[PDB]
Amino acid sequence: SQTVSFAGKEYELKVIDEKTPILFQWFEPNPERYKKDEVPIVNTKQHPYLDNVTNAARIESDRMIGIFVDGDFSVNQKTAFSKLERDFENVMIIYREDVDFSMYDRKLSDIYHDIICEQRLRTEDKRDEYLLNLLEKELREISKAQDSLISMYAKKRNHAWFDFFRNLALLKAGEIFRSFGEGCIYLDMDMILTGKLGTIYAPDGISMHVDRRNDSVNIENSAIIVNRSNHPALLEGLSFMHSKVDAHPYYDGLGKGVKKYFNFTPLHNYNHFCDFIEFNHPNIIM
């Protein structure tokens, strides 16, 4: 029955039902920062991320709560993570190295070819010789062992490491927990649940957090709702990811794909698109 529209197009509000699992993410650059036997996720008064995750799990007793982690954790840390699963019936630790994301890979060489043709297809003296040389040299230096975009990102230890694999996890969307249903509700660990989510709706089954604090409005990647795996708005984001080797910070492949999917251009109304896309919940403090 029920529809909304944006930029003169109609979209179905689609259900994100009560079995949709919740996913949180923590990627740890420095696992040595924890005491022996503690779970290597920050849990300070300022950033009580682990407590927030467990709080959500206690509140949503009939949903699966996942913790998507990555980093060079010790055996002793793996033990602590395992204890956390044991103390909570509905909590699952998901290590990035155990997930197969290979369906979403692209070869680095393919990416360089594309980047290179495009540079080569430039007017006689608009060509960037400095850039082309560098790109060609970079391409020569790739081994077949290491010729994967995913492998490169998995060795990274910064923010790009986190975002790249968040995007992949949102595509898997529930397949990542391989009871649980097929969408995913992705939340930042600083978000606090104060009650049950219930049934949620989103346009074409996707929504994103909009922060309205400071009397300003900004789309944030901090919470994302998807109703199905491989959502097309996210696959658009995957194309942007596939078109770069080392995307610059704030390239925001994810954001770009979603906006592209709803035809939100730089000339469209930003406030309208925020109202439309927003994930807002009375029982979550975001």
Residue numbers in the entry: 21 to 198, 209 to 316
Give passages from the manuscript:
The non-LEE encoded effector protein B (NleB) has GT activity and inhibits NF-κB activation by transferring N-acetyl glucosamine (GlcNAc) to host death domain-containing proteins and to glyceraldehyde 3-phosphate dehydrogenase (GAPDH). The T3SS effectors SseK1 and SseK2 from Salmonella typhimurium SL1344 are NleB orthologs that behave as NleB1-like GTs, although they differ in protein substrate specificity.
NleB2 from E. coli O145:H28 was solved in its unliganded form. The overall crystal structures of SseK1 and SseK2 from S. typhimurium as well as NleB2 from enteropathogenic E. coli are similar, revealing high identities between the amino acids at the active binding site level. Each HEN residue of SseK3 is on the β-strand, but in the case of SseK1, SseK2, and NleB2, the HEN residues are located on the loop structure. This has implications for the differences in the activity of the enzymes due to the HEN motif because the loop structure is more flexible than the β-strand.
